[PDB]
């Protein structure tokens with residue numbers, strides 16, 4: 038017989054609650070911005086403006102009582118805790134000694150990071166991406182980058198997810214020594230220093246919380262009060278659409294690998310592995326972990342770091358210790374968690390790790406069979422070729438011979454086949470290796486015809502510097518160009534070459550190029566033909582599948598050719 042409660046929607050955070058508390062309007066340390074609770078804190082204000090209020094309230098979700106407390110006046114705030122994400126019809130009842138009166142039901146949301154409160158994501162994929170029916174057991178992976186939402190304007194709902202089995206989210210940094218990040222300029226280091234305030238060294242953090250969970254995406258149905266927004270809320274809604282798609286955070290990458298060189302100390306590994314466990318319990322849409330340490334032994338961005346005696350065994354120990362932790366999560370959740378790693382494939386990188394030992398702990402190795410040549414120097418070559426190119430010298434392919442100064446080659450050439458063969462020779466099983474495809478070109482200026490030793494092959498020339506171009510042409514950093522920019526501005530509709538560029542293909546290497554003989558611009562990349570050759574290769578060797586770097590740079594053609602090539606190999 039009291040008055041039925043009316044729910045104050047605006048005073049109850051629009052009935053949006055969450056197991057994860059996320060700061061939405063600042064940028065601070067990771068431990069200050071992100072706190073995961075086993076029970077969501079619920080606070081609901083209700084009013085009884087007319088008649089009597091009664092003395093007690095009960096709260097129901099879907100008919101089931103979840104809380105009770107005192108009413109002592111005409112406005113009451115009910116505070117309680119609840120453990121399970123999703124959407125529930127809430128009713129609040131006010132009671133006196135004579136009876137109870139229930140409010141009309143209203144939907145409350147309790148966010149959780151598995152996306153249990155979310156509908157399947159609405160997609161907006163470029164229709165140049167075709168449908169395939171590739172065997173679900175073949176890996177078809179790609180990297181999606183956190184910063185691609187900015188100038189590149191490529192968001193989670195643009196991914197052709199039905200053509201993927203694995204999405205690797207690039208990149209999760211590690212707090213600690215990170216000089217390599219400073220050298221890249223822009224805000225990357227300042228963002229990391231901010232994220233790491235109040236965080237122990239060697240723990241993972243989110244690099245850009247605005248892209249990860251603050252930015253409101255209208256296509257995802259985000260509102261002011263939505264407790265999780267950003268790329269991460271869209272990836273959660275994507276798992277509701279595609280529950281078998283594996284979404285895996287990639288830790289490190291070329292500029293964020295400096296802290297790994299301190300993993301020779303096991304206490305730093307222990308700190309890192311515990312931070313990864315907490316991260317996967319905080320962000321439950323993730324299905325494992327991908328380690329992108331570039332590179333054990335060195336030769337990467339940190340010129341002053343790298344230990345070829347100890348980094349190998351440390352990498353192996355880290356995989357073993359991650360697999361231990363992941364087994365604990367599997368035991369706790371009843372889920373399967375995957376452990377993978379993207380690795381360098383030059384002989385001088387592979388020689389520093391016993392991968393047959395490491396891979397026993399791992400589901401897949403993503404062989405980075407790209408970046409073999411590029412604008413960091415003026416020597417052209419195929420950056421992602423399967424085999425040795427026509428431009429190579431006698432003895433250069435297998436490392437038997439000498440360079441132009443007569444100095445012995447130190448090891449076999451940088452090609453995808455040389456890397457895969459070295460890894461098989463160590464005893465890595467073929468069915469754990471994933472072959473990489475580039476959705477980008479690398480390139481140079483100044484490779485003009487007077488510099489060539491073979492007049493029909495620009496790979497025999499000499500550059501003056503890195504390729505330059507505008508972001509309108511897909512050039513986001515000197516020396517690199519999106520595949521879709523090569524296609525729009527250099528190849529043209531017919532693949533015969535436009536804007537002063539001509540197309541060529543080195544059939545021995547399985548590698549395309551475009552070359553502008555007057556500016557000397559020369560770009561090495563992957564195309565439909567070379568990607569079919571890679572798929573025929575992967576199928577011949579019984580590799581696990583193919584993956585690509587990075588998805589925003591494709592227009593459909595490369596991912597289509599990945600599926601075609603895997604269907605089509607002979």
Ligand SMILES: CCCn1cnc2c1c(=O)n(CCCCC(C)=O)c(=O)n2C
Pocket residue numbers: 058059060061063065068069070071072
């Ligand atoms: C986490 C979401 C709640 N939340 C939302 N915005 C927040 C917080 C928060 O908790 N802290 C400080 C945390 C106290 C010290 C610690 C060990 O974390 C903040 O500064 N900001 C801006």
Ligand SMILES: CCCn1cnc2c1c(=O)n(CCCCC(C)=O)c(=O)n2C
Pocket residue numbers: 184187188223224225226228244245
């Ligand atoms: C804005 C995109 C430029 N951009 C180009 N390359 C980039 C970035 C970038 O931003 N971040 C992350 C740091 C966060 C910076 C910010 C504005 O919050 C990166 O790691 N890389 C490699």
Ligand SMILES: CCCn1cnc2c1c(=O)n(CCCCC(C)=O)c(=O)n2C
Pocket residue numbers: 291292381382383384386407408409413451
């Ligand atoms: C962010 C990465 C791009 N990047 C920026 N500077 C670079 C690279 C790069 O990729 N490689 C090739 C690594 C060798 C890989 C192999 C086949 O072993 C480089 O040598 N330098 C100087």
